[PDB]
Amino acid sequence: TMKVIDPQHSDKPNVLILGSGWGAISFLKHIDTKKYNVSIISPRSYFLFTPLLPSAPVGTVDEKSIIEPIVNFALKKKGNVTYYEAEATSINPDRNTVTIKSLSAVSQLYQPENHLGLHQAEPAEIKYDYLISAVGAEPNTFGIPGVTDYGHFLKEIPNSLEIRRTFAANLEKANLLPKGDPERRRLLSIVVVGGGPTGVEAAGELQDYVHQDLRKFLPALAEEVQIHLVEALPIVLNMFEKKLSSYAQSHLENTSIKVHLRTAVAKVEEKQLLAKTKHEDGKITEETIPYGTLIWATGNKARPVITDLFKKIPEQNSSKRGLAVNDFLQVKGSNNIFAIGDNAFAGLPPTAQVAHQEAEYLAKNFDKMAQIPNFQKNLSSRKDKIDLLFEENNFKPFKYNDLGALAYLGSERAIATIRSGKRTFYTGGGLMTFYLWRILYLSMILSARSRLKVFFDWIKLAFFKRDFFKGL
Amino acid sequence: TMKVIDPQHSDKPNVLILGSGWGAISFLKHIDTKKYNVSIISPRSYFLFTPLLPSAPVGTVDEKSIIEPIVNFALKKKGNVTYYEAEATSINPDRNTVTIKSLSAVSQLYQPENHLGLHQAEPAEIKYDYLISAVGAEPNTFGIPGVTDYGHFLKEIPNSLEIRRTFAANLEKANLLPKGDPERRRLLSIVVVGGGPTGVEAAGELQDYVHQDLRKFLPALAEEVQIHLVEALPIVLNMFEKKLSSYAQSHLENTSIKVHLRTAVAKVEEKQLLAKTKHEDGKITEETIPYGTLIWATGNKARPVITDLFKKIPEQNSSKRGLAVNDFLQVKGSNNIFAIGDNAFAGLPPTAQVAHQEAEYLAKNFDKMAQIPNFQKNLSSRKDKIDLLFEENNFKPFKYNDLGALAYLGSERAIATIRSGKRTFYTGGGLMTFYLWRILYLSMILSARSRLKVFFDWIKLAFFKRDFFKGL
Ligand SMILES: Cc1cc2nc3c(=O)[nH]c(=O)nc-3n(C[C@H](O)[C@H](O)[C@H](O)COP(=O)(O)OP(=O)(O)OC[C@H]3O[C@@H](n4cnc5c(N)ncnc54)[C@H](O)[C@@H]3O)c2cc1C
Ligand SMILES: Cc1cc2nc3c(=O)[nH]c(=O)nc-3n(C[C@H](O)[C@H](O)[C@H](O)COP(=O)(O)OP(=O)(O)OC[C@H]3O[C@@H](n4cnc5c(N)ncnc54)[C@H](O)[C@@H]3O)c2cc1C
Ligand SMILES: NC(=O)C1=CN([C@@H]2O[C@H](COP(=O)(O)OP(=O)(O)OC[C@H]3O[C@@H](n4cnc5c(N)ncnc54)[C@H](O)[C@@H]3O)[C@@H](O)[C@H]2O)C=CC1
Ligand SMILES: NC(=O)C1=CN([C@@H]2O[C@H](COP(=O)(O)OP(=O)(O)OC[C@H]3O[C@@H](n4cnc5c(N)ncnc54)[C@H](O)[C@@H]3O)[C@@H](O)[C@H]2O)C=CC1
Ligand SMILES: [Mg+2]
Ligand SMILES: [Mg+2]
Ligand SMILES: [Mg+2]
Ligand SMILES: [Mg+2]
Ligand SMILES: [Mg+2]
Ligand SMILES: [Mg+2]
Ligand SMILES: [Mg+2]
Ligand SMILES: [Mg+2]
Ligand SMILES: [Mg+2]
Ligand SMILES: [Mg+2]
Ligand SMILES: [Mg+2]
């Protein structure tokens, strides 16, 4: 009644990867396809270079520039790679299967090719020997009413399109109104919730667009726009040194952004929202803020496919943020499922930096398991022995190395702290820090094509105004 | 009951331009905004470099690369320019007004700025002293049933997006079917109707995508695609020398395109179409062709706003292709309306070449009228005297100079004939002709930005596969 895909052409173990983001793609880049048969399930046919997503809505870079098709990474592999463009809806640990839905395409990047007899929008289950879970996390509204109906997350490419569309629409409407109309002022106002680096960069890029481009042809309109950054803690960018946070805040304010600290959004309606400030003395004030565009850049929560898995594994029943993993990124209470990135919790921060390091670590471990015959044998064995097998063969546990953090602030200023272990190599803000920010992000891009395209976008930006088309 | 916009701040004449394509933008580039007050009505906020439109659906170039916002041309003008993003629905010659609808935005690129009190989706009429009509022409189905419902024109940016979407969707579906399934073969088949340069280049670019890119990751899928070029005349590209047409046809066939000459599409259904061949002996055969993607690249017809104007002007009642104009591009039976490009008929071909030459000619005439006080006086005068006034002051009539024609054929071959007057400088086909085709098109681009972007797209193409995203 339910189609099952179980490739037994080879005696290479079937490694199944969920997702096409930081964990999945970094893992894919390092996994040995000569030793393993690799399959990928993800509803998104491309990798997204998340740190430049805030630059996309106003066209500092193009949406296409920061994405790279999964297929292009896969063509570089020596062995067999299969990509299922579908969503994993259920992880079935006791039968070693993943259920998929919303199937759109299957791509078998090998020329023998076995017809699988799948049809679009028909469920199927995919058999694995090893599961690597990297489906990431979804934006968290914290139960605040209205944010889903009236705000825009900043998490995926379509969010960037939506934001451009809303804001460009607001600008056209607003410019038809007479100066000093409160409705005009509402349309020209943007609220960015979340004073983490995502919200800060979003606010900064928007301000860049308004000041550098919009101002060239509608200066009076540009003058009236008001961007708000709303943050619940007493400082923005709290992962940085306090003095860098103050530098950032003063800079943002200097570019005309209004920063609301100690402030939380309580309720969102279609044209206004309620913000409460909890002052240091303890008193609580409240302000209703009319807004044209709301961008919700706070926090992530676990995905339904992952929370369901919490129930199916006893050791995992007490999980909340993500799957709990051991020293070897093995999901607790499972001997063949691994979890990396934001869908896993190990006490580390939910960043690309961690996801990328975990992926590379895990792929190296898979190199070693391929030299030890017993691993692939415990697959068929009755006993979950893979936990023991890591300590037995003295695999080192995963150790995260924090390399620091960066944040663009708009108007050619950035802050940065670069490190390794206990050594700090760079830490500060300014004009040169901005150039460093560019060179560094360019270096972290996972593909030559995307790297060139971003580079071409920045060159073009030196001579011309950003592309800000309503429907492109 | 109907708002009327009549700027009388200055004693500069109000020149009103309809459209934002080849005629409108070329004219705008050359019109003297120190002598004239310039306004523009067009539903499309940008100029479209039409000759590269066939390269967009498969990402040989990107859609953004071949467009340039009207506003960027306008910023370069010294005087006052206003852009109404709306559709001209009625030209009202006796009151010197144009009715607009579907208003989205108004942009006054000048600092004084008078609030006009317009609202979105409220009709208005725009007063002019001089009207320049350049709304172009729309695609012509020839009454063939089904082409509107089931095909895609190749006329505007959204057509390019639609075609990519259809064909990318068909490829995913087809690759899920087993080899030799007729439904798979149907999904992999494309029909391009029209053997003019538009249809040829569309066919050529698609074949390029299939052979150079698709083949790299789904070679068997690439092998099964079949592109058809359907043309009713006995030769393709009939504006060229017969020998260049034969070269082109053999080339297309050599790249695996199937060329159907003396063949017309009689009827289009959702999954097949009826094609009839009228052989040279006189006999008529018919073939039903299953297709996944239909591209309709034949012919244009006059727009409704233009046909309505036919009825309102006596001298224009017998018009069919477009507005009839005199030696000075003045609309016959009107003393203040001019028509250039495809909305005008003067016995010249409907090309960008003609539209661009007319525009530049007309803007130079407007330079001369600005030295002769009587022109701007006949505006207020009771008598239509502007017709006489051109012969009187010995303005030379517009003379078109054919510079030739180019066509890309796919697989790095093109044909080209370059001329001026009776002299031919170049005429032939081949690899070098392709490089010439690139250098020449780059030269005809109207903006530095668009020119750089196209150039970057071609560079990227030298190293990487085309971007072919379903939803970007
Ligand atoms: C705008 C923005 C900027 C950021 N900037 C930085 C930065 O500068 N530095 C930094 O360290 N971190 C940054 N991050 C955070 C970083 O992107 C994440 O920590 C990282 O993406 C986590 O990697 P992941 O693979 O776990 O999830 P992701 O990278 O998000 O990838 C998850 C993938 O799984 C796929 N998927 C989703 N649901 C399913 C399903 N049901 N089945 C199968 N597949 C599924 C998705 O399509 C996605 O491709 C940023 C995040 C955002 C939103
Ligand atoms: C795919 C393609 C490729 C081509 N390649 C070539 C080539 O290589 N060489 C060549 O010489 N010619 C070429 N042409 C022909 C050339 O593009 C046209 O002749 C060109 O458009 C000149 O016509 P125009 O400027 O009058 O109108 P267009 O350039 O078509 O533009 C007319 C403008 O009027 C606007 N408009 C439409 N309706 C209304 C309304 N109701 N009110 C107000 N404004 C309106 C439109 O938005 C548009 O911006 C090509 C055409 C196509 C479709
Ligand atoms: N350039 C860089 O180095 C970047 C790094 N990152 C990392 O990616 C991860 C993703 O996190 P982010 O999206 O940036 O979120 P974040 O969690 O770092 O910040 C969200 C912020 O919004 C605030 N907030 C929560 N609820 C609120 C409410 N109801 N009303 C008002 N404010 C509220 C919180 O105090 C919080 O600090 C982070 O861990 C971050 O460190 C993200 C972007 C850029
Ligand atoms: N690179 C270049 O020089 C380019 C120039 N152009 C211009 O675009 C303009 C469009 O002019 P058109 O009059 O439309 O010529 P067209 O050449 O686009 O004509 C379309 C062709 O399809 C044929 N056809 C018509 N009905 C058919 C049917 N029902 N079934 C099958 N075939 C059918 C016609 O005979 C005709 O040859 C041309 O003047 C052309 O020069 C367009 C693209 C490129
Ligand atoms: Mg196997
Ligand atoms: Mg991932
Ligand atoms: Mg990602
Ligand atoms: Mg995530
Ligand atoms: Mg994850
Ligand atoms: Mg025009
Ligand atoms: Mg055009
Ligand atoms: Mg100016
Ligand atoms: Mg036209
Ligand atoms: Mg016209
Ligand atoms: Mg179809």
PDB file of N, CA and C in Angstrom, chain B residues 288-316:
ATOM      1  N   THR B 288      -1.161  15.577 -36.211  1.00  0.00           N
ATOM      2  CA  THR B 288      -1.465  15.961 -34.853  1.00  0.00           C
ATOM      3  C   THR B 288      -0.167  15.825 -34.061  1.00  0.00           C
ATOM      4  N   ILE B 289       0.254  16.920 -33.421  1.00  0.00           N
ATOM      5  CA  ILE B 289       1.524  16.930 -32.683  1.00  0.00           C
ATOM      6  C   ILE B 289       1.327  17.072 -31.164  1.00  0.00           C
ATOM      7  N   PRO B 290       1.591  16.000 -30.417  1.00  0.00           N
ATOM      8  CA  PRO B 290       1.559  16.109 -28.948  1.00  0.00           C
ATOM      9  C   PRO B 290       2.694  17.029 -28.496  1.00  0.00           C
ATOM     10  N   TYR B 291       2.445  17.936 -27.547  1.00  0.00           N
ATOM     11  CA  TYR B 291       3.476  18.886 -27.100  1.00  0.00           C
ATOM     12  C   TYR B 291       3.358  19.088 -25.585  1.00  0.00           C
ATOM     13  N   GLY B 292       4.488  19.348 -24.920  1.00  0.00           N
ATOM     14  CA  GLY B 292       4.496  19.724 -23.505  1.00  0.00           C
ATOM     15  C   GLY B 292       4.520  21.240 -23.337  1.00  0.00           C
ATOM     16  N   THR B 293       5.228  21.927 -24.230  1.00  0.00           N
ATOM     17  CA  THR B 293       5.397  23.362 -24.114  1.00  0.00           C
ATOM     18  C   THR B 293       5.160  23.965 -25.478  1.00  0.00           C
ATOM     19  N   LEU B 294       4.294  24.975 -25.541  1.00  0.00           N
ATOM     20  CA  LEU B 294       4.065  25.670 -26.805  1.00  0.00           C
ATOM     21  C   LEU B 294       4.465  27.143 -26.715  1.00  0.00           C
ATOM     22  N   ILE B 295       5.312  27.556 -27.643  1.00  0.00           N
ATOM     23  CA  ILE B 295       5.760  28.939 -27.665  1.00  0.00           C
ATOM     24  C   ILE B 295       5.282  29.552 -28.969  1.00  0.00           C
ATOM     25  N   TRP B 296       4.550  30.663 -28.847  1.00  0.00           N
ATOM     26  CA  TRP B 296       3.859  31.263 -29.982  1.00  0.00           C
ATOM     27  C   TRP B 296       4.543  32.568 -30.319  1.00  0.00           C
ATOM     28  N   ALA B 297       5.375  32.536 -31.353  1.00  0.00           N
ATOM     29  CA  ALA B 297       6.242  33.671 -31.679  1.00  0.00           C
ATOM     30  C   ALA B 297       5.965  34.193 -33.090  1.00  0.00           C
ATOM     31  N   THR B 298       4.693  34.224 -33.463  1.00  0.00           N
ATOM     32  CA  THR B 298       4.346  34.856 -34.717  1.00  0.00           C
ATOM     33  C   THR B 298       3.538  36.115 -34.481  1.00  0.00           C
ATOM     34  N   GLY B 299       3.912  37.154 -35.220  1.00  0.00           N
ATOM     35  CA  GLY B 299       3.060  38.296 -35.489  1.00  0.00           C
ATOM     36  C   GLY B 299       2.516  39.148 -34.371  1.00  0.00           C
ATOM     37  N   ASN B 300       2.299  40.418 -34.690  1.00  0.00           N
ATOM     38  CA  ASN B 300       1.656  41.334 -33.761  1.00  0.00           C
ATOM     39  C   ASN B 300       0.429  41.989 -34.381  1.00  0.00           C
ATOM     40  N   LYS B 301      -0.483  42.457 -33.536  1.00  0.00           N
ATOM     41  CA  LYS B 301      -1.648  43.198 -34.001  1.00  0.00           C
ATOM     42  C   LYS B 301      -1.810  44.476 -33.155  1.00  0.00           C
ATOM     43  N   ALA B 302      -2.558  45.448 -33.676  1.00  0.00           N
ATOM     44  CA  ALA B 302      -2.653  46.749 -33.021  1.00  0.00           C
ATOM     45  C   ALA B 302      -3.402  46.635 -31.687  1.00  0.00           C
ATOM     46  N   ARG B 303      -3.053  47.509 -30.745  1.00  0.00           N
ATOM     47  CA  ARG B 303      -3.686  47.488 -29.422  1.00  0.00           C
ATOM     48  C   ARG B 303      -5.075  48.156 -29.410  1.00  0.00           C
ATOM     49  N   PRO B 304      -5.923  47.745 -28.456  1.00  0.00           N
ATOM     50  CA  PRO B 304      -7.280  48.307 -28.425  1.00  0.00           C
ATOM     51  C   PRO B 304      -7.268  49.834 -28.257  1.00  0.00           C
ATOM     52  N   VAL B 305      -6.375  50.374 -27.434  1.00  0.00           N
ATOM     53  CA  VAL B 305      -6.338  51.820 -27.275  1.00  0.00           C
ATOM     54  C   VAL B 305      -6.074  52.509 -28.617  1.00  0.00           C
ATOM     55  N   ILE B 306      -5.354  51.808 -29.502  1.00  0.00           N
ATOM     56  CA  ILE B 306      -5.004  52.336 -30.827  1.00  0.00           C
ATOM     57  C   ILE B 306      -6.139  52.134 -31.847  1.00  0.00           C
ATOM     58  N   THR B 307      -6.786  50.967 -31.820  1.00  0.00           N
ATOM     59  CA  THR B 307      -7.889  50.758 -32.752  1.00  0.00           C
ATOM     60  C   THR B 307      -9.052  51.722 -32.443  1.00  0.00           C
ATOM     61  N   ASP B 308      -9.311  51.959 -31.154  1.00  0.00           N
ATOM     62  CA  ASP B 308     -10.312  52.953 -30.765  1.00  0.00           C
ATOM     63  C   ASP B 308      -9.991  54.324 -31.352  1.00  0.00           C
ATOM     64  N   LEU B 309      -8.715  54.687 -31.328  1.00  0.00           N
ATOM     65  CA  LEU B 309      -8.320  55.984 -31.857  1.00  0.00           C
ATOM     66  C   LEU B 309      -8.587  56.054 -33.363  1.00  0.00           C
ATOM     67  N   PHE B 310      -8.549  54.896 -34.045  1.00  0.00           N
ATOM     68  CA  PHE B 310      -8.861  54.820 -35.488  1.00  0.00           C
ATOM     69  C   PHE B 310     -10.238  55.441 -35.756  1.00  0.00           C
ATOM     70  N   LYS B 311     -11.221  55.080 -34.918  1.00  0.00           N
ATOM     71  CA  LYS B 311     -12.605  55.553 -35.043  1.00  0.00           C
ATOM     72  C   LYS B 311     -12.801  57.059 -34.759  1.00  0.00           C
ATOM     73  N   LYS B 312     -12.007  57.599 -33.838  1.00  0.00           N
ATOM     74  CA  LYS B 312     -12.131  58.990 -33.397  1.00  0.00           C
ATOM     75  C   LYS B 312     -11.485  60.007 -34.346  1.00  0.00           C
ATOM     76  N   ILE B 313     -10.738  59.521 -35.331  1.00  0.00           N
ATOM     77  CA  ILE B 313     -10.100  60.408 -36.312  1.00  0.00           C
ATOM     78  C   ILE B 313     -10.432  59.917 -37.724  1.00  0.00           C
ATOM     79  N   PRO B 314     -11.135  60.765 -38.498  1.00  0.00           N
ATOM     80  CA  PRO B 314     -11.666  60.439 -39.831  1.00  0.00           C
ATOM     81  C   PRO B 314     -10.588  59.878 -40.773  1.00  0.00           C
ATOM     82  N   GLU B 315      -9.500  60.629 -40.914  1.00  0.00           N
ATOM     83  CA  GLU B 315      -8.353  60.243 -41.738  1.00  0.00           C
ATOM     84  C   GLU B 315      -7.750  58.891 -41.349  1.00  0.00           C
ATOM     85  N   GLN B 316      -8.216  58.329 -40.236  1.00  0.00           N
ATOM     86  CA  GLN B 316      -7.616  57.157 -39.615  1.00  0.00           C
ATOM     87  C   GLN B 316      -8.614  56.005 -39.588  1.00  0.00           C
TER      88      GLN B 316
END
